[PDB]
Amino acid sequence: PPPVRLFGVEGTYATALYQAAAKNSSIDAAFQSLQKVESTVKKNPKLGHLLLNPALSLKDRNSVIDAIVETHKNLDGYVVNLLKVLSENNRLGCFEKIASDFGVLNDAHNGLLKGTVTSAEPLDPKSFKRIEKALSASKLVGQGKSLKLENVVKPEIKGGLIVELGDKTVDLSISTKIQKLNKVLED
Amino acid sequence: NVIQDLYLRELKDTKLAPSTLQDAEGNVKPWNPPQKPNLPELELQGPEALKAYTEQNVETAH
């Protein structure tokens, strides 16, 4: 079965969509349409995102689907079969969730990886580049896979860095070292 | 790094916290000496007792 299996419902949907469109080898098309519909949900911010709430019927839901393919009939069609399915299963609150999840699967198929450099403050671009280079250089990025290394600001972590990718982290941060230090002086 | 910073800061800026031997004395039991060497009293000193005893118990052994 296609690489990367995202456990959990709604990602059971994503997995299905992913695997189905991988076997139809039209993942770029799917992804593109998913971005577009995700965008048109976001760009229908009231009265089409604020009515993803359940309350509507099956029959009222069907007319929501019709409105969705009315906004742009540039949809892939496998994702239109998915839209019907989501209507029938009467969930669409986790629609963009499924889209995001498909995105993870898709960009895994592309090979793209995401990382993180949580810090208390946004670091040098030099630091960003050096780490991206380093990670690509290191076996940590296997290559044939890319790194969107994202520094995030988490003031809660005081100074430091934590490099993250592939569920493998190196955490050289001041807070954590301080924790161990405080503890060693409680002895 | 941070280890060095802490090590330096900690050691340098106060090594020991204040302490006073005099204050300690109040909180501990002080040595105090035993009272009296004592001498045992002369038990049944002299024949005052004996003369008394011979008379007192002239009791025979049957």
- Which residues on A lie below 8 Å from B6 (Cβ)? 178, 181
Q: What technique was this entry resolved by?
A: cryo-EM
Q: In this structure, how many other beta carbons lie within 10 angstroms of the beta carbon of residue A102?
A: 26
Longest CA span, chain A? 69
* Cα separation of the two ends of chain B: 103
Tokens in use for B27?
A: 């909180």
Best mutation site among A157, A161, A174 for testing chain B: the one with the most B CBs within 10 Å? A174
CA A113/CA A149 separation, integer angstroms: 8
Amino acid sitting at position B3: I
Resolution (A): 4.4
Instruction: Please identify which residue in the block is written with the tokens 């503890």.
Output: A183
End-to-end CA gap in chain A? 53
| Chain A interface test: which of B3, B4, B6, B8 (most A C-beta within 10 Å) | B6
- What six digits make up the tokens of A70? 């009315």
Where are the alpha helices (H) located in chain A, listed in sequence order?
11-22, 27-42, 58-70, 78-88, 96-110, 125-137, 174-184
Chain A, window 153-182: residues with a beta carbon less than 8 angstroms from a chain B beta carbon: 174, 177-178, 181
Q: Are A71 and A40 in contact (CB under 8 A)?
A: yes
CB atoms within 10 A of CB A18: 29
The distance of A172 to chain B (nearest Cα, Å) reads 10
Angstrom distance (rounded) from CA A114 to CA A102: 15
Query: What is the C-alpha separation between A35 and A25, in angstroms, rounded?
Result: 18
Top CATH class, A11-110: mainly alpha
| Residue B59 structure tokens | 């009791």
